[PDB]
Protein backbone atom coordinates (compact mmCIF):
# COMPACT_ATOMS: atom_id res chain seq x y z
CA UNK A 1 0.00 0.00 0.00
CA UNK A 2 1.16 3.50 -0.90
CA UNK A 3 1.86 6.29 1.58
CA UNK A 4 -1.15 8.64 2.06
CA UNK A 5 0.56 11.86 1.01
CA UNK A 6 -2.64 13.21 -0.55
CA UNK A 7 -4.25 13.40 2.89
CA UNK A 8 -1.92 16.28 3.84
CA UNK A 9 -1.01 17.81 0.47
CA UNK A 10 -4.58 17.76 -0.87
CA UNK A 11 -6.24 18.64 2.44
CA UNK A 12 -9.13 21.11 2.35
CA UNK A 13 -8.08 22.83 5.59
CA UNK A 14 -4.57 23.73 6.68
CA UNK A 15 -3.53 24.76 10.17
CA UNK A 16 -2.22 28.09 11.35
CA UNK A 17 1.56 27.97 11.66
CA UNK A 18 1.52 28.42 15.44
CA UNK A 19 -0.60 25.26 15.76
CA UNK A 20 1.03 23.44 12.84
CA UNK A 21 -0.23 19.92 12.15
CA UNK A 22 1.84 16.73 12.17
CA UNK A 23 0.93 13.48 10.42
CA UNK A 24 3.21 10.47 10.76
CA UNK A 25 3.78 8.34 7.67
CA UNK A 26 4.43 4.68 8.46
CA UNK A 27 4.06 1.18 7.02
CA UNK A 28 3.82 2.17 3.36
CA UNK A 29 5.81 2.75 0.17
CA UNK A 30 6.39 6.37 -0.85
CA UNK A 31 6.96 7.45 -4.46
CA UNK A 32 8.62 10.87 -4.25
CA UNK A 33 9.25 11.47 -7.96
CA UNK A 34 5.46 11.73 -8.23
CA UNK A 35 5.83 14.83 -6.05
CA UNK A 36 9.15 15.93 -7.58
CA UNK A 37 7.57 15.72 -11.06
CA UNK A 38 4.87 18.26 -10.31
CA UNK A 39 5.15 21.81 -11.63
CA UNK A 40 2.73 23.07 -8.95
CA UNK A 41 5.27 23.86 -6.20
CA UNK A 42 6.81 27.30 -5.74
CA UNK A 43 9.41 25.86 -3.33
CA UNK A 44 10.65 22.29 -2.93
CA UNK A 45 14.19 22.06 -1.53
CA UNK A 46 15.65 19.11 0.39
CA UNK A 47 18.29 18.94 3.12
CA UNK A 48 20.66 16.07 3.81
CA UNK A 49 18.97 14.04 1.07
CA UNK A 50 19.02 14.03 -2.72
CA UNK A 51 15.41 14.34 -3.95
CA UNK A 52 16.17 12.00 -6.86
CA UNK A 53 17.82 9.33 -4.65
CA UNK A 54 14.76 9.45 -2.36
CA UNK A 55 12.74 6.77 -4.17
CA UNK A 56 15.47 4.23 -3.39
CA UNK A 57 15.93 4.81 0.35
CA UNK A 58 14.26 3.82 3.62
CA UNK A 59 13.60 5.66 6.88
CA UNK A 60 12.54 4.69 10.39
CA UNK A 61 9.89 7.41 10.77
CA UNK A 62 8.51 9.91 8.25
CA UNK A 63 6.49 12.94 9.33
CA UNK A 64 4.51 15.45 7.27
CA UNK A 65 3.98 18.90 8.80
CA UNK A 66 1.58 21.35 7.15
CA UNK A 67 0.66 24.98 7.80
CA UNK A 68 0.06 28.33 6.09
CA UNK A 69 2.50 31.27 6.06
CA UNK A 70 3.28 34.24 3.84
CA UNK A 71 5.24 33.80 0.64
CA UNK A 72 8.10 35.92 1.98
CA UNK A 73 8.23 33.68 5.08
CA UNK A 74 8.88 30.43 3.18
CA UNK A 75 12.60 31.24 3.42
CA UNK A 76 12.28 30.90 7.20
CA UNK A 77 11.23 27.24 6.80
CA UNK A 78 14.82 25.97 6.71
CA UNK A 79 17.47 24.83 9.21
CA UNK A 80 19.18 27.62 11.11
CA UNK A 81 16.79 30.34 9.95
CA UNK A 82 15.80 33.42 11.92
CA UNK A 83 12.58 35.39 12.14
CA UNK A 84 9.09 35.49 13.58
CA UNK A 85 8.12 32.13 12.07
CA UNK A 86 11.36 30.18 12.47
CA UNK A 87 11.93 31.36 16.05
CA UNK A 88 8.39 31.62 17.47
CA UNK A 89 6.17 29.30 15.37
CA UNK A 90 7.99 26.46 13.58
CA UNK A 91 11.69 25.65 14.05
CA UNK A 92 13.72 23.00 12.20
CA UNK A 93 16.85 21.45 13.74
CA UNK A 94 20.31 22.17 12.39
CA UNK A 95 20.74 18.53 11.29
CA UNK A 96 17.30 18.45 9.63
CA UNK A 97 16.90 15.66 7.07
CA UNK A 98 13.90 16.15 4.82
CA UNK A 99 12.21 18.34 2.25
CA UNK A 100 10.30 21.63 2.44
CA UNK A 101 7.47 22.00 -0.09
CA UNK A 102 5.38 25.13 -0.64
CA UNK A 103 2.89 26.52 -3.15
CA UNK A 104 0.73 29.62 -3.48
CA UNK A 105 -2.75 29.26 -1.99
CA UNK A 106 -4.21 32.75 -2.36
CA UNK A 107 -7.18 31.17 -4.16
CA UNK A 108 -8.11 28.97 -1.18
CA UNK A 109 -6.91 30.96 1.85
CA UNK A 110 -8.11 34.50 1.00
CA UNK A 111 -11.72 35.07 -0.05
CA UNK A 112 -13.80 38.21 -0.58
CA UNK A 113 -13.34 40.18 2.62
CA UNK A 114 -9.94 38.72 3.46
CA UNK A 115 -9.28 35.86 5.86
CA UNK A 116 -8.38 36.53 9.50
CA UNK A 117 -8.50 32.94 10.79
CA UNK A 118 -4.84 32.24 10.00
CA UNK A 119 -2.70 33.25 12.98
CA UNK A 120 0.98 33.32 13.90
CA UNK A 121 2.86 33.94 17.13
CA UNK A 122 4.38 37.42 16.96
CA UNK A 123 5.95 37.45 20.44
CA UNK A 124 7.76 34.95 22.64
CA UNK A 125 10.02 35.24 25.67
CA UNK A 126 12.45 32.74 24.12
CA UNK A 127 12.95 30.94 20.83
CA UNK A 128 11.23 27.64 20.18
CA UNK A 129 13.10 24.41 20.32
CA UNK A 130 12.90 22.35 17.11
CA UNK A 131 9.50 20.73 16.52
CA UNK A 132 7.86 22.58 19.41
CA UNK A 133 4.24 23.72 18.98
CA UNK A 134 3.35 26.59 21.32
CA UNK A 135 -0.41 27.17 21.45
CA UNK A 136 -0.48 29.09 24.75
CA UNK A 137 -2.06 32.54 24.93
CA UNK A 138 -0.23 34.23 27.80
CA UNK A 139 -0.30 38.01 27.45
CA UNK A 140 3.19 39.04 26.34
CA UNK A 141 5.05 41.75 28.26
CA UNK A 142 6.70 43.99 25.65
CA UNK A 143 7.70 46.87 27.93
CA UNK A 144 8.79 47.52 31.51
CA UNK A 145 5.44 47.47 33.33
CA UNK A 146 4.03 44.05 34.27
CA UNK A 147 0.86 42.84 32.59
CA UNK A 148 -0.95 40.55 35.09
CA UNK A 149 -2.74 38.59 32.37
CA UNK A 150 -4.61 41.64 31.03
CA UNK A 151 -4.29 43.27 27.62
CA UNK A 152 -3.08 46.85 27.49
CA UNK A 153 -0.29 49.05 26.24
CA UNK A 154 2.89 46.99 25.77
CA UNK A 155 0.83 43.94 26.86
CA UNK A 156 -0.21 42.03 23.74
CA UNK A 157 -2.15 38.92 22.89
CA UNK A 158 0.72 36.79 21.55
CA UNK A 159 -1.12 35.49 18.47
CA UNK A 160 -1.60 37.94 15.60
CA UNK A 161 -3.80 37.65 12.53
CA UNK A 162 -2.46 37.37 9.02
CA UNK A 163 -4.02 39.84 6.62
CA UNK A 164 -4.53 37.60 3.58
CA UNK A 165 -6.65 39.91 1.47
CA UNK A 166 -7.13 38.63 -2.09
CA UNK A 167 -5.21 41.52 -3.75
CA UNK A 168 -2.12 41.42 -1.48
CA UNK A 169 1.40 41.35 -2.79
CA UNK A 170 2.75 37.94 -3.75
CA UNK A 171 4.97 37.99 -0.65
CA UNK A 172 2.07 38.78 1.70
CA UNK A 173 -0.21 36.22 0.01
CA UNK A 174 -0.84 32.94 1.85
CA UNK A 175 1.32 29.94 0.99
CA UNK A 176 0.58 26.34 1.89
CA UNK A 177 3.71 24.48 3.00
CA UNK A 178 4.38 20.82 3.77
CA UNK A 179 7.60 19.72 5.49
CA UNK A 180 8.65 16.07 5.21
CA UNK A 181 10.91 14.81 8.01
CA UNK A 182 13.05 11.72 7.38
CA UNK A 183 14.20 10.40 10.75
CA UNK A 184 16.75 7.57 10.72
CA UNK A 185 17.08 5.53 13.92
CA UNK A 186 18.80 2.24 14.73
CA UNK A 187 15.40 0.59 14.37
CA UNK A 188 13.21 -1.07 11.69
CA UNK A 189 12.43 1.03 8.64
CA UNK A 190 8.74 1.82 8.20
CA UNK A 191 8.78 3.84 4.94
CA UNK A 192 10.65 2.96 1.74
CA UNK A 193 10.41 3.57 -1.98
CA UNK A 194 10.15 1.27 -5.03
Amino acid sequence: NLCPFGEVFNATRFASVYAWNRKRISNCVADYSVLYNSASFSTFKCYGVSPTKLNDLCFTNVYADSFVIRGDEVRQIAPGQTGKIADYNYKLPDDFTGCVIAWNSNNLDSKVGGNYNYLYRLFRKSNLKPFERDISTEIYQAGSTPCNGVEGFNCYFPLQSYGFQPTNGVGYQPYRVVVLSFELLHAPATVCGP
Partner: antibody
Amino acid sequence: QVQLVQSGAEVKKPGESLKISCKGSGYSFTSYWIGWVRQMPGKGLEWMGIIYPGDSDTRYSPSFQGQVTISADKSISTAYLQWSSLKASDTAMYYCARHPSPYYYGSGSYSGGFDYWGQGTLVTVSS
Amino acid sequence: DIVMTQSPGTLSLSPGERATLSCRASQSVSSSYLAWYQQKPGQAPRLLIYGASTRATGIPARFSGSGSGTEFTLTISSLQSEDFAVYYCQQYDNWPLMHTFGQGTKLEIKR
Protein backbone atom coordinates in the same frame (compact mmCIF):
# COMPACT_ATOMS: atom_id res chain seq x y z
CA GLN B 1 12.21 1.19 21.57
CA VAL B 2 13.27 4.17 23.70
CA GLN B 3 16.09 3.38 26.12
CA LEU B 4 18.17 5.45 28.53
CA VAL B 5 21.24 3.70 29.94
CA GLN B 6 23.42 5.08 32.73
CA SER B 7 27.00 4.25 33.64
CA GLY B 8 27.89 1.81 36.39
CA ALA B 9 28.01 2.25 40.14
CA GLU B 10 30.74 4.54 41.47
CA VAL B 11 32.69 4.26 44.73
CA LYS B 12 34.80 7.31 45.47
CA LYS B 13 36.85 9.16 48.15
CA PRO B 14 36.01 12.72 49.19
CA GLY B 15 37.71 15.29 47.02
CA GLU B 16 37.82 13.09 43.93
CA SER B 17 36.21 14.27 40.72
CA LEU B 18 33.53 12.15 39.06
CA LYS B 19 31.73 12.11 35.72
CA ILE B 20 28.76 9.84 35.05
CA SER B 21 27.03 9.40 31.71
CA CYS B 22 23.51 8.82 30.37
CA LYS B 23 23.12 7.46 26.83
CA GLY B 24 19.79 7.47 24.99
CA SER B 25 18.70 5.46 21.97
CA GLY B 26 15.55 4.76 20.01
CA TYR B 27 14.67 8.44 19.58
CA SER B 28 16.15 11.77 18.48
CA PHE B 29 18.35 12.44 21.51
CA THR B 30 18.76 16.13 20.63
CA SER B 31 14.99 16.77 20.52
CA TYR B 32 14.16 15.99 24.17
CA TRP B 33 15.43 17.48 27.40
CA ILE B 34 17.43 15.33 29.82
CA GLY B 35 17.00 15.95 33.53
CA TRP B 36 19.12 14.78 36.45
CA VAL B 37 17.41 13.71 39.69
CA ARG B 38 19.06 12.88 43.02
CA GLN B 39 17.74 10.36 45.56
CA MET B 40 19.79 10.17 48.75
CA PRO B 41 19.43 6.87 50.65
CA GLY B 42 15.94 6.51 52.09
CA LYS B 43 14.93 9.98 50.89
CA GLY B 44 12.83 11.57 48.17
CA LEU B 45 13.56 12.88 44.70
CA GLU B 46 15.35 16.20 44.17
CA TRP B 47 15.63 17.96 40.82
CA MET B 48 19.24 18.86 40.04
CA GLY B 49 19.15 20.27 36.52
CA ILE B 50 18.13 19.79 32.91
CA ILE B 51 19.82 20.08 29.51
CA TYR B 52 18.58 20.23 25.93
CA PRO B 53 21.25 18.27 23.99
CA GLY B 54 20.36 19.99 20.71
CA ASP B 55 22.16 23.16 21.79
CA SER B 56 23.32 22.30 25.36
CA ASP B 57 20.82 24.75 26.88
CA THR B 58 21.49 23.91 30.54
CA ARG B 59 19.30 24.83 33.53
CA TYR B 60 20.23 24.06 37.14
CA SER B 61 18.29 24.02 40.37
CA PRO B 62 19.50 26.82 42.69
CA SER B 63 20.37 24.12 45.25
CA PHE B 64 22.78 22.59 42.70
CA GLN B 65 23.88 25.66 40.71
CA GLY B 66 27.67 25.69 40.77
CA GLN B 67 27.65 22.51 42.86
CA VAL B 68 27.85 20.32 39.76
CA THR B 69 28.17 20.50 35.96
CA ILE B 70 25.69 19.14 33.41
CA SER B 71 26.71 18.72 29.77
CA ALA B 72 25.99 16.63 26.68
CA ASP B 73 27.73 15.18 23.61
CA LYS B 74 25.35 15.01 20.64
CA SER B 75 27.67 12.79 18.60
CA ILE B 76 27.24 9.91 21.08
CA SER B 77 23.72 10.82 22.28
CA THR B 78 24.99 11.17 25.84
CA ALA B 79 24.25 13.51 28.74
CA TYR B 80 26.76 13.95 31.56
CA LEU B 81 26.73 14.87 35.24
CA GLN B 82 30.03 15.63 36.94
CA TRP B 83 31.45 16.87 40.24
CA SER B 84 34.83 18.55 40.59
CA SER B 85 35.27 17.53 44.25
CA LEU B 86 32.91 14.86 45.59
CA LYS B 87 31.67 14.99 49.15
CA ALA B 88 30.30 12.40 51.54
CA SER B 89 26.88 14.07 51.39
CA ASP B 90 26.79 13.34 47.64
CA THR B 91 26.28 9.61 48.29
CA ALA B 92 23.00 8.98 46.47
CA MET B 93 21.27 7.39 43.51
CA TYR B 94 21.41 9.67 40.46
CA TYR B 95 18.71 9.29 37.81
CA CYS B 96 18.79 10.70 34.31
CA ALA B 97 15.37 10.99 32.71
CA ARG B 98 13.93 12.17 29.41
CA HIS B 99 11.55 15.13 29.65
CA PRO B 100 9.64 16.33 26.58
CA SER B 101 8.83 20.01 26.85
CA PRO B 102 5.13 20.89 27.22
CA TYR B 103 5.42 22.29 23.67
CA TYR B 104 7.20 19.38 21.98
CA TYR B 105 5.08 17.97 19.15
CA GLY B 106 7.53 15.56 17.48
CA SER B 107 5.21 12.58 17.98
CA GLY B 108 2.11 14.31 16.61
CA SER B 109 0.71 14.87 20.11
CA TYR B 110 1.73 16.53 23.36
CA SER B 111 3.48 14.82 26.26
CA GLY B 112 4.86 15.83 29.64
CA GLY B 113 6.93 14.91 32.66
CA PHE B 114 9.95 12.64 32.94
CA ASP B 115 8.46 9.93 30.73
CA TYR B 116 11.51 7.64 30.48
CA TRP B 117 14.07 7.04 33.22
CA GLY B 118 17.49 5.48 33.38
CA GLN B 119 18.15 2.66 35.81
CA GLY B 120 20.13 5.06 38.00
CA THR B 121 23.81 5.35 38.88
CA LEU B 122 24.64 4.57 42.50
CA VAL B 123 27.37 6.90 43.79
CA THR B 124 29.02 6.10 47.13
CA VAL B 125 31.38 8.74 48.55
CA SER B 126 33.14 7.53 51.70
CA SER B 127 36.51 7.67 53.41
CA ASP C 1 10.44 29.38 43.72
CA ILE C 2 7.51 27.04 44.39
CA VAL C 3 7.44 24.50 47.23
CA MET C 4 5.49 21.26 46.82
CA THR C 5 3.98 19.62 49.91
CA GLN C 6 2.40 16.16 49.74
CA SER C 7 -0.17 14.70 52.15
CA PRO C 8 -0.27 12.34 53.82
CA GLY C 9 3.28 11.13 54.50
CA THR C 10 2.44 7.44 54.81
CA LEU C 11 -0.87 5.59 54.48
CA SER C 12 -1.88 1.97 55.11
CA LEU C 13 -4.69 0.44 53.05
CA SER C 14 -5.97 -2.93 51.84
CA PRO C 15 -6.53 -3.69 48.15
CA GLY C 16 -9.80 -2.65 46.58
CA GLU C 17 -9.95 0.61 48.53
CA ARG C 18 -9.47 4.12 47.15
CA ALA C 19 -6.30 6.15 47.74
CA THR C 20 -6.58 9.96 47.67
CA LEU C 21 -3.14 11.60 47.49
CA SER C 22 -2.82 15.37 47.88
CA CYS C 23 -0.07 17.63 46.58
CA ARG C 24 0.13 21.27 47.72
CA ALA C 25 1.98 24.15 46.07
CA SER C 26 3.20 27.33 47.76
CA GLN C 27 2.24 29.34 44.66
CA SER C 28 -0.28 28.69 41.89
CA VAL C 29 0.83 26.21 39.24
CA SER C 30 -1.40 28.13 36.83
CA SER C 31 -0.13 26.10 33.85
CA SER C 32 -1.32 22.77 35.34
CA TYR C 33 2.23 21.58 34.57
CA LEU C 34 2.12 18.93 37.26
CA ALA C 35 3.00 15.25 37.03
CA TRP C 36 2.66 12.19 39.25
CA TYR C 37 5.19 9.38 39.57
CA GLN C 38 5.27 5.95 41.18
CA GLN C 39 8.44 4.42 42.59
CA LYS C 40 8.86 0.87 43.86
CA PRO C 41 11.88 -0.30 45.92
CA GLY C 42 15.05 -0.68 43.89
CA GLN C 43 13.42 0.83 40.81
CA ALA C 44 13.46 4.11 38.93
CA PRO C 45 10.31 6.26 39.16
CA ARG C 46 7.59 5.79 36.56
CA LEU C 47 5.45 8.52 35.02
CA LEU C 48 1.72 8.17 35.75
CA ILE C 49 0.16 11.59 35.09
CA TYR C 50 1.26 14.71 33.26
CA GLY C 51 -0.54 17.99 32.72
CA ALA C 52 -2.26 17.30 36.09
CA SER C 53 -4.90 15.08 34.46
CA THR C 54 -3.49 13.15 31.46
CA ARG C 55 -2.38 9.55 31.93
CA ALA C 56 0.85 8.36 30.34
CA THR C 57 0.74 5.62 27.73
CA GLY C 58 0.03 2.28 29.39
CA ILE C 59 -1.17 3.63 32.75
CA PRO C 60 -4.44 1.97 33.83
CA ALA C 61 -7.59 4.02 34.26
CA ARG C 62 -7.76 3.43 38.03
CA PHE C 63 -5.12 6.18 38.31
CA SER C 64 -6.76 9.60 37.94
CA GLY C 65 -5.17 13.02 38.44
CA SER C 66 -7.13 16.18 39.19
CA GLY C 67 -6.70 19.69 40.49
CA SER C 68 -5.74 23.24 39.55
CA GLY C 69 -4.21 26.25 41.24
CA THR C 70 -2.60 25.16 44.50
CA GLU C 71 -4.22 21.78 45.31
CA PHE C 72 -3.68 18.77 43.09
CA THR C 73 -4.88 15.22 43.72
CA LEU C 74 -4.00 11.72 42.54
CA THR C 75 -6.91 9.31 43.06
CA ILE C 76 -6.38 5.55 42.75
CA SER C 77 -9.86 4.03 42.77
CA SER C 78 -9.44 0.23 42.91
CA LEU C 79 -6.12 -0.50 44.62
CA GLN C 80 -4.22 -3.59 43.52
CA SER C 81 -1.21 -5.30 45.08
CA GLU C 82 1.19 -3.73 42.57
CA ASP C 83 -0.10 -0.23 43.41
CA PHE C 84 1.36 -0.05 46.93
CA ALA C 85 4.54 2.01 46.51
CA VAL C 86 5.78 5.59 46.88
CA TYR C 87 4.18 8.39 44.87
CA TYR C 88 5.63 11.80 44.01
CA CYS C 89 4.24 14.96 42.43
CA GLN C 90 6.30 17.21 40.16
CA GLN C 91 5.79 20.84 39.20
CA TYR C 92 7.38 22.36 36.10
CA ASP C 93 5.38 25.57 35.81
CA ASN C 94 8.28 27.86 34.86
CA TRP C 95 9.55 25.66 32.06
CA PRO C 96 12.37 24.98 31.66
CA LEU C 97 13.86 26.84 34.58
CA MET C 98 12.51 25.19 37.73
CA HIS C 99 11.28 21.74 38.73
CA THR C 100 10.23 20.73 42.24
CA PHE C 101 9.16 17.39 43.69
CA GLY C 102 7.12 16.70 46.77
CA GLN C 103 8.56 14.66 49.61
CA GLY C 104 6.47 11.64 48.65
CA THR C 105 3.64 9.48 49.97
CA LYS C 106 4.08 5.79 50.82
CA LEU C 107 1.29 3.25 50.29
CA GLU C 108 1.31 0.30 52.68
CA ILE C 109 -0.61 -2.97 52.36
CA LYS C 110 -2.98 -3.62 55.25
CA ARG C 111 -2.97 -7.10 56.79
